[PDB]
Amino acid sequence: IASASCTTXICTCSCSS
Secondary structure: OOOOOOOOOOOOOOOOO
């Protein structure tokens, strides 16, 4: 349900580094 860069179907994923 939350995270950055890491799922396929809700909406986060990745986005820095």
